[PDB]
Amino acid sequence: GSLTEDGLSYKEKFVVRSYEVGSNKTATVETIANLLQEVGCNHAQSVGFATTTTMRKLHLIWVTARMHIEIYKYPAWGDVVEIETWCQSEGRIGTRRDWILKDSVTGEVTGRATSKWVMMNQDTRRLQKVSDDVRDEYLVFCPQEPRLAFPEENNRSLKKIPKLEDPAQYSMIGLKPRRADLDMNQHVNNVTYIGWVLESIPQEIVDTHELQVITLDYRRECQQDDVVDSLTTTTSDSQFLHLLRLSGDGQEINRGTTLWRKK
Amino acid sequence: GSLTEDGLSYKEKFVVRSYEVGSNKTATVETIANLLQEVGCNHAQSVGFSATTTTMRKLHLIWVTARMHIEIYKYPAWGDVVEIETWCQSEGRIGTRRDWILKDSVTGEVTGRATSKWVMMNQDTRRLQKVSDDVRDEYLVFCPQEPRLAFPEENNRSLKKIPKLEDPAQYSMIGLKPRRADLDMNQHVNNVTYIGWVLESIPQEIVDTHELQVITLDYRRECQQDDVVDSLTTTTSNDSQFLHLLRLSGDGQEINRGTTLWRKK
Lengths: 263, 265
Ligand SMILES: O=C(COC(F)F)N1C[C@H]2CCC[C@H]2C1
Ligand SMILES: O=C(COC(F)F)N1C[C@H]2CCC[C@H]2C1
Description:
Entry title: PanDDA analysis group deposition -- Crystal Structure of FatA in complex with Z2072621991
Number of strands of chain A: 12
Assembly: dimeric
CATH topology of the largest domain in chain A: Thiol Ester Dehydrase, Chain A
Bound molecules: ligand LQP
Oligomer: homodimer
Chains A, B: Oleoyl-acyl carrier protein thioesterase 1, chloroplastic
Organism of A, B: Arabidopsis thaliana
Distance between the termini of chain A: 33 Å
Largest sheet of chain A: 12 strands, antiparallel
PDB class: hydrolase
């Protein structure tokens, strides 16, 4: 696509593909999640990026800490969806990347997303606050006045997610990543976690309901040779509490919540 | 994309995406396989197939993949535009063939090509059957009459008989299950998932040092949503050759067999 007239956001139109849709012939939440990360990459490339000059000298990367997605209408197979994305500072806590999905024909908002990214060393995996010299390097590509995709004060994207208590109501055990699940850098794609979380949602809910909200908290990366267990409990529209953990020791890697509506 | 001037083939340009590339920052063979099935679906839709005829719908009949052969000379890089041209052709009452040609949008050179053999089957009973004349006439008007082969060679590798892998296998990837992302719109496992499962038993060292040049896959059975697969591999060979076997974890029922050919980077 291209940067908007002010250079402070990026837009891209995607045509939804045959293998990108589910049983309802509309894009899956993982296809939407894939399209959000693609428009985010093109926005970074269009302004010279995904690290700054300081970041590569210090072996620093932006890592996902939290992802929140709300979908009102899933684009059908053959439909064009327009996604607009931008970044914003959260001082020294990290960066936020926001998205707005629109119907290319009507112009209506059909979905929206927000993500929280934190600075981390590539080698030790130790968290880090954003330095001023780093902030100066990317502020010129962000709106100065706040531009929020989810502007509601105390909303679903900032809610504290509790840890799921054993025994879980549902579970999908023995989940492993394949080469298609890794990115260009050999790490498991952040979208795979969405898929693994939804694997423990019972098929009856998937057949009768539509996923409206998904909030995911990223605690630890699943390695190529790791095995995950996906756990789910109904906390309620249908509401679920989720937990991804290592098959062996039970080390937590993700926690989240989903909200579904009757079709 | 669109049908060509004669309406006997379809072309589409795809821009390669960030999540669609592997370690070498070029499209994976599963991304290529996904793009081939996407250009095939748009070709069917552009001539009124949204993918059976009136006779096929009335008789609960569908086209199923029996064999897929893909040969790649250059994998498109992240950001590159790849142009795929696809067409179909009759093989009398045996079935249909769908062929593909991948081209570099900048140079116009052929960077890859594929051929597939499809057979008619009843959706419910899963029993194969020959292409009837009533069906043949309904789709012949969308195929070239003179043969148009992507792999025309006198002794091409797309028609070679694949043997069954003998136990013990040299390599293996056990306990492979499909997730919802592996199913298509009809809830059946996507034919591309089998390519990935086959490659899961190729050792990582081969993937890091070699590039996949040829892959031939034979489809014997479909893996159900609640099935578990075992991927087996044995080296049969500057170039590396492998013999593959996908089978059910339990009884050892065969679902796929294939071969791969790799070349040093
Ligand atoms: O990768 C980041 C920061 O994390 C998150 F926001 F994507 N970026 C990408 C660069 C291009 C857009 C502004 C710059 C911030
Ligand atoms: O899908 C097929 C044939 O099955 C298989 F070979 F792909 N089709 C759909 C139409 C495309 C032009 C020929 C028509 C027959």
